[PDB]
Amino acid sequence: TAPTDGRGGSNPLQIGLGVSVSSTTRIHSQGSVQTTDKNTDVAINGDGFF
């Protein structure tokens, strides 16, 4: 409420109840690489998918 007849204003008096999950997020930073001995096993080095 706004100040009126010689009084000041007043804050809203809400309680506030509970917490819940909004969302998951996947994260796509580049991973570490290791070499193998099989020639036919490429790993992309930037972005894009098979």
Partner 1 sequence: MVSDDGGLTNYLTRSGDFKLDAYGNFVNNAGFVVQGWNINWDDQTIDSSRTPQNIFIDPGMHIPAAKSTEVAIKANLNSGLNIGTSSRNLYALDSVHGWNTKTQRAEDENDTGTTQFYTTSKNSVEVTEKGVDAGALFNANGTGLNLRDG
Partner 2 sequence: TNGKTFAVAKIAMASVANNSGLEEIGGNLFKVTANSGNIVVGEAGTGGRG
Structural tokens at position 29: 């930073």
Q: How far apart are CA 39 and CA 49, in angstroms?
A: 19
For position 7 contacting partner 1 by CB under 8 A, the verdict is: yes
For position 10 contacting partner 1 by CB under 8 A, the verdict is: yes
Which 17-46 positions form the footprint of partner 2 (CB under 8 A)?
22
| Pick 7 or 26: Cβ nearer partner 1 | 7
Q: How many helices (H) and strands (E) does the chain have?
A: 0, 0
16 binds, among partner 2, partner 1, none (CB under 5 to 8 A by kind): partner 2
